[PDB]
Amino acid sequence: LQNIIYNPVIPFVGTIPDQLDPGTLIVIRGHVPSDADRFQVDLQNGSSVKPRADVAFHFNPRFKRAGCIVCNTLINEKWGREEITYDTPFKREKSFEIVIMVLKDKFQVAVNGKHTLLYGHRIGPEKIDTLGIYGKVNIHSIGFSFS
Ligand SMILES: CC(=O)N[C@H]1[C@H](O[C@H]2[C@@H](O)[C@@H](CO)O[C@@H](O[C@H]3[C@H](O)[C@@H](O)[C@H](O)O[C@@H]3CO)[C@@H]2O)O[C@H](CO)[C@@H](O[C@@H]2O[C@H](CO)[C@H](O)[C@H](O)[C@H]2O)[C@@H]1O
């Protein structure tokens, strides 16, 4: 793995140091605290906050009731149609590994070595240069594998 960040402070906002061409991996290892209601990983076009940077891929584990993962895209401060995954591997008080693989037409996400979800590109992945990690989560490491 390349361009590793260890023990970043959350909220984390970081420049992705190369392009997300097909085959590129983003590998995030961390732990979910006991009081977590949600956290999110955002693949952003920049780091503007007003207007809020467009979010090509919002990957949003939620923990209330049975839990789920919500995926969506933010374009000019408007959320698109949510894509919900109900078979969620995340749990409070458990460590995890997220691997986001960039493919031509979509993201593929594996968590803890197991396929979790697909998310079709809504924004060109060439527009992505910024990794945001927010909410109730502890991140141990971030690393990339560029293709
Ligand atoms: C209130 C809140 O937590 N806001 C977050 C924001 O969350 C939204 C996002 O998860 C979308 C995805 O579709 O869903 C929003 O909730 C919807 C419900 O899911 C749905 O059932 C209901 O019908 O409609 C709801 C409203 O649309 C949810 O609020 O996520 C963004 C982007 O990650 C957060 O903004 C980012 O926050 C960080 C700090 O945590 C920084 O400030 C970033 O700059 C900022 O972009 C926002 O806090």
Residue numbers in the entry: 8 to 154
List sentences from the manuscript.
Galectin-8 is a member of the tandem-repeat galectin category, having two CRDs in tandem that are joined by an amino acid linker of variable length. The two CRDs of galectin-8, i.e. galectin-8N and galectin-8C, share ~40% sequence identity and exhibit differential glycan binding specificities. The galectin-8N CRD exhibits a typical β-sandwich comprising two anti-parallel β-sheets with the concave side housing the carbohydrate-binding site. The binding groove is formed from six beta strands labelled S1 to S6, with amino acids on strand S4-S6 forming the glycan recognition pocket (referred to as the “primary binding site”).
The galectin-8N-LNnT complex was obtained by soaking LNnT into an apo-crystal, and the structure was determined at 2.0 Å. The electron density maps showed unambiguous electron density for all the four sugars of the tetrasaccharide, and with the reducing end occupying the primary binding site. The non-reducing end galactose ring forms CH-π type interactions with Tyr141 and O2 engages in hydrogen bonding interactions with Asp49. Despite having identical ligand conformation, the orientation of unique Arg59 on the long S3-S4 loop is different in our galectin-8N-LNnT complex to that seen in all the reported galectin-8N apo and ligand-bound structures. In the galectin-8N-LNnT complex, Arg59 is directed towards the non-reducing end galactose, whereas in the other structures, including the galectin-8N-LNFIII complex, it faces towards the conserved Trp86.
